[PDB]
Design an enzyme around this catalytic site. Structure first.
Site, PDB file in Angstrom:
ATOM      1  N   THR A 155      -2.578  -3.216  10.245  1.00 27.37           N
ATOM      2  CA  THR A 155      -1.701  -3.282  11.456  1.00 27.37           C
ATOM      3  C   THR A 155      -2.500  -3.663  12.687  1.00 27.37           C
ATOM      4  OG1 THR A 155      -0.952  -1.200  10.520  1.00 27.37           O
ATOM      5  CG2 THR A 155       0.324  -2.117  12.347  1.00 27.37           C
ATOM      6  N   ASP A 178      -1.746   4.660  -0.532  1.00 26.69           N
ATOM      7  CA  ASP A 178      -1.811   3.249  -0.392  1.00 26.69           C
ATOM      8  C   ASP A 178      -3.197   2.649  -0.212  1.00 26.69           C
ATOM      9  OD1 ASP A 178      -1.263   0.501  -0.216  1.00 26.69           O
ATOM     10  OD2 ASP A 178       0.103   0.740   1.542  1.00 26.69           O
ATOM     11  N   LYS A 183      -3.543   4.764   8.946  1.00 29.33           N
ATOM     12  CA  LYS A 183      -2.449   4.908   9.847  1.00 29.33           C
ATOM     13  C   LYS A 183      -1.514   6.083   9.477  1.00 29.33           C
ATOM     14  CE  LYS A 183       0.495   1.746   7.653  1.00 29.33           C
ATOM     15  NZ  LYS A 183       1.171   0.439   7.600  1.00 29.33           N
ATOM     16  N   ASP A 214      -7.145   0.336   5.862  1.00 28.65           N
ATOM     17  CA  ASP A 214      -5.795   0.479   6.292  1.00 28.65           C
ATOM     18  C   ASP A 214      -5.404   1.931   6.656  1.00 28.65           C
ATOM     19  OD1 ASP A 214      -3.160  -0.579   6.670  1.00 28.65           O
ATOM     20  OD2 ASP A 214      -2.672  -0.081   4.534  1.00 28.65           O
ATOM     21  N   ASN A 234       0.414   6.349   6.268  1.00 31.24           N
ATOM     22  CA  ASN A 234      -0.334   6.583   5.058  1.00 31.24           C
ATOM     23  C   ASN A 234      -0.808   7.938   4.973  1.00 31.24           C
ATOM     24  OD1 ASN A 234      -0.016   3.991   5.738  1.00 31.24           O
ATOM     25  ND2 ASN A 234      -1.638   3.376   4.362  1.00 31.24           N
TER      26      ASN A 234
END
EC number: 2.7.11.11
Length: 339
Positions: free
Chosen positions: A190, A173, A157, A155, A160
């Site tokens: 995402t 996260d 991005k 994850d 984060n």
């Protein structure tokens, strides 16, 4: 590959232990004064809290036991703890405490004031090739570190990527993370950073990570991201076709790196290749970058944020406030004995 191998192994062990033995209960809610809501989650809230004794703000993620079950996010919610609890590295956000109370769970990190990257980026417009580089150099080292522990990140991005008082970065996260070995098949993240493996769902791997590094960069350097449409399905076909357009202002070595990462073939994508990270770590683009200073956080930062004082939430958004409920009976204490 002399000093940068003694570590990884030295570092793979330290971790193992922790991995394989996580302190649990380490505090109680009351030891803290709730200040303000920082970020969100469909399974909690991250907010600002002041530690009574040591006037130290931290940042408290708090997931409600009952919302994580409807989404079985348990399996998950448990390793994010187990990971942060064992993970150890500069560019990683520090976990300080974890306790649970009747109703919902708490992870309490260090408070990265500077604010989330996604924003500076949108404010500023785009990043200057160096600027972007400064960051990337931090992910690369980060994923180098992780990936070595059989931990896909899953994850990546801008939301984060938090920014500290010294423009360096800390990723937060780990909620999607997963220690693995080989293939896994979960569709998480995402739609914009979705490596094209995931999209077909054919057991991906760390490779999906490096792929997100490109999307990361592209966007860092353009504002907009490579693949992007209105509604998800669309963004989907886009990604697999893999036709990427470079903006005119891209350096040449920028455009080189890229199409090596944004490679719809794992079996030909930096990070996945036989030379491993050294393919990236060596790519021209990283010509200037000294991989230690960064690491050693000896390098002078391109960017900064102004912190009016200790626990300044300016760099943050304004969300609606709620309470920190605690029903009178141990709700859902079954599935979370590990916590």
């Amino acid at each position: 590959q002399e000093s940068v191998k003694e570590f990884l192994a030295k570092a793979k062990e330290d971790f193992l232990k922790k991995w394989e033995t996580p302190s649990q209960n380490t505090a109680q809610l009351d030891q803290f004064d709730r200040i303000k809501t920082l970020g969100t989650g469909s399974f909690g809230r991250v907010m600002l809290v002041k530690h009574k004794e040591s006037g130290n703000h931290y940042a408290m993620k708090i997931l409600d036991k009952q919302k994580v079950v409807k989404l079985k996010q348990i399996e998950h919610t448990l390793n994010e703890k187990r990971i942060l609890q064992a993970v150890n590295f500069p560019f990683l956000v520090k976990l300080e405490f974890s306790f649970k109370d009747n109703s919902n769970l708490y992870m309490v990190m260090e408070y990265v004031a500077g604010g989330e990257m996604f924003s500076h980026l949108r404010r500023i417009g785009r990043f200057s090739e160096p600027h972007a580089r400064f960051y990337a150099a931090q992910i690369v080292l980060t994923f180098e570190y992780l990936h070595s522990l059989d931990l896909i990140y899953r994850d990546l991005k801008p939301e984060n990527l938090l920014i500290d008082q010294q423009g360096y970065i800390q990723v937060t996260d780990f909620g999607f993370a997963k220690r693995v070995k080989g293939r896994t098949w979960t569709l998480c993240g995402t739609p914009e950073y979705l490596a094209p493996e995931i999209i077909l769902s054919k057991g991906y791997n760390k490779a999906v990570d490096w792929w997100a590094l490109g999307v990361l960069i592209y966007e860092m350097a353009a504002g907009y991201p490579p693949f992007f449409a209105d509604q998800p399905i669309q963004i989907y076909e886009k990604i697999v076709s893999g036709k990427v357009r470079f903006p005119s202002h891209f350096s040449s070595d920028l455009k080189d790196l890229l199409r090596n990462l944004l490679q719809v073939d794992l079996t030909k994508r930096f990070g996945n290749l036989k030379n491993g990270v050294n393919d990236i770590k060596n790519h021209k683009w990283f010509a200037t970058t000294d991989w230690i200073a960064i690491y050693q956080r000896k390098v002078e930062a391109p960017f900064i944020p102004k912190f009016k004082g200790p626990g300044d939430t300016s760099n943050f958004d304004d969300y609606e406030e709620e309470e920190i409920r605690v029903s009178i009976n141990e709700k859902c204490g079954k599935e979370f004995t590990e916590f």
